Chain A
């Protein structure tokens, strides 16, 4: 069962999520919403019926080779993963679609950038993690470069990004530079340089050791 990896929609507008299969219109299709860390929850079943408790703006259709989950009047809280599902009686197995992430569209928002030197307690353990935080931005795409005494770093940082916020539709992102304490104390200036659509030019956050 083939679904688009991603669908984007503005608040109050209508999202349509497809579920493809050869003659899928001949069998019943059911739809689940899954929020991060949570179990899936059926939102449409038997092609177009709604479980009690589900808002009327969730509806479904199924015909030919395509089933469709429609979410009308989209809200920020509709950001989630959505899966279609059938029972395949030719192999006697439940089959899920590959899932669709719904992204809510909003205006561009520049990140608020913060840099964190390593703690003394970590340095005592012999390692230094330097953390750069990009807070509450949109869209998700951003570039973070690390510079140590103006020398560009590569291969020694990792990034993590939040799921889109269920209320304000922004993202946050961390980049963590990891050095040995021995290497860390050899340098003075630690800097995070951030590029994003909401910024006129790259923003740099830095500290001098001590």
Chain B
């Protein structure tokens, strides 16, 4: 399996430092230029920095010059990004990406899933979970879970441990004036199933190690 895995993301106070790591597997790491690319929530891709195989050549965008240092350890098949003096403009999902030298240029042919860096003074807080109870037309009922007052992103919600996926809508979180996030996850199901089928939403907030299972009944 050809893979990049980024780690090290989390909440960092403004002005402080954070080091990201990216572990490669399934290919010859020392043969490739490697990049960091970032994406602020809701915005476009922004390349950040890259480093050649023997680490003699590094390039950065002006916005991170000096503050950021990219390094690599070929023995550990690993890429690193040291980020100092962090600001709110640095808040983003950070991707590890492999550079491919094609016949006519350079592009990214492999990416990790990314790791989220949230630059904030706010404290980490797990969500409260509340039922959205069913109580229905045309043969269809809707039910859900309200996931309230957490920080930072992300939260994941599944239904019946992943067995229920059809008709599920998990909304993008909204930031409340309190500075905390909230979202809902809903599902539509046959209304005739309400008497017999159990519906449980499984909420995971990894930053606070919060796992909640909430049964949603009429």
On A, residues with C-beta under 8 Å from B are: 27-28, 30, 32, 34, 38-42, 45-47, 49, 51, 83, 85-87, 92-99, 112, 114, 116-119, 121-122, 125, 129, 131, 133, 135, 158-162, 172, 174, 176, 178, 207
> Residue of B at shortest CB range from A172?
B169
A-B contact pairs, 6 of them (CB 8 A): A39-B95, A46-B105, A94-B35, A98-B44, A119-B130, A178-B176
Min distance, Cβ B139 to any Cβ of chain A, angstroms: 11
Q: Determine if B83 is an interface residue (Cβ-Cβ < 8 Å).
A: no
Count of CB-CB pairs between chains A and B under 8 Å: 128
Of B109, B137, B171, the most chain A CB neighbours within 10 A belong to: B171
Q: A119-B131, A135-B142 are in contact. Are A96 and B108 (CB under 8 A)?
A: no
Is the pair B109, A42 in contact by a Cβ cutoff of 8 Å? yes
Q: Determine if B123 is an interface residue (Cβ-Cβ < 8 Å).
A: no
Q: Which residues of B contact A51 (CB under 8 A)?
A: 109
> Residue of A at shortest CB range from B138?
A112
On B, residues with C-beta under 8 Å from A are: 35, 37, 44-47, 50, 59, 61, 95, 100, 102-109, 111-114, 128, 130-133, 135, 137-138, 140, 142, 144, 146, 148, 169, 171-174, 176, 182-184, 186, 188
Q: How far is the CA of A119 from the CA of B135 in the complex (A)?
A: 12
Is the pair A121, B184 in contact by a Cβ cutoff of 8 Å? no
Q: How far is the CA of A49 from the CA of B171 in the complex (A)?
A: 36
Which of B46, B105, B106, B169 contacts A162, CB < 8 Å?
Answer: B169
Q: How far is the CA of A178 from the CA of B108 in the complex (A)?
A: 45
Q: How far is the CA of A84 from the CA of B162 in the complex (A)?
A: 35
Is the pair A87, B106 in contact by a Cβ cutoff of 8 Å? yes
Q: Which residues of B contact A42 (CB under 8 A)?
A: 107-109
